Design a protein around this ligand. Structure first.
Ligand code: DPE
Length: 197
């Protein structure tokens, strides 16, 4: 449901082909929040339960609302947590294709983590989806050091966080349809582009 730790719980001897690491929004529950489960279900349908590992960013990532105001849009502790998960995936399953995503503060966290990641691991992330990207204007719709073709940003008209503000308006809470269709569609397409089918 809202908590998935497939990577941490997974057996290294039976690695999945695809590993999805997702960061939830501020004040959301579990480690997947409101959007993560929808994306997860669709990935499982495409690759099979044993074909994909769903891993939310928990641990030190408290998804504290106030942290949106920090320099990188999240805390240093949260970034260290997500970096650690990417590193665990790389070590536990070196042949797996990675995909990532984040919503709101989680999108800023995903961008910061990917920017800091060792290039060899970063290059394994076939696609990343960001919803209500809090650093959209500041980063010009990109994730630093990461290709535009592997990035998909979902920013609703009227969602003030996409336009340089930290005000939470109604459009910020309207990403449900995107998480159910275009987001997983993009991720599946990007994985298949490199793994074939
Ligand atoms: P997103 O992380 C929402 C981020 C926007 C809110 C940032 C403002 C923090 C200070 C609020 C006090 C006025 O999760 C859905």
């Amino acid at each position: 449901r809202t908590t998935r730790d497939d990577l941490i719980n997974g057996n290294s001897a039976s690695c999945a082909d695809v590993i999805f690491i997702y960061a939830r929004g501020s004040t959301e529950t579990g480690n997947l929040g409101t959007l993560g489960p929808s994306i997860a279900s669709n990935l499982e349908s495409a690759f099979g339960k044993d074909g994909v590992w769903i891993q939310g960013v928990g641990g030190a990532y408290r998804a504290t609302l106030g942290d949106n105001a920090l320099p990188r849009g999240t805390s240093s502790a949260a970034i260290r947590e997500m970096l650690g998960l990417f590193q665990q995936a790389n070590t536990k399953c070196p042949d797996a294709t990675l995909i990532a995503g984040g919503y709101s503060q989680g999108a800023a966290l995903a961008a910061a983590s990917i920017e800091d990641l060792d290039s060899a691991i970063r290059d394994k992330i076939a696609g990343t989806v960001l919803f209500g990207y809090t650093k959209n204007l500041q980063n010009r719709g990109r994730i630093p050091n990461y290709p535009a073709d592997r990035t998909k940003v979902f920013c609703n008209t009227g969602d003030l966080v996409c336009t340089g503000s930290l005000i939470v308006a109604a459009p910020h809470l309207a990403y449900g349809p995107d998480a159910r269709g275009p987001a997983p569609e993009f991720l599946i397409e990007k994985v298949r582009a490199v793994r074939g089918s």
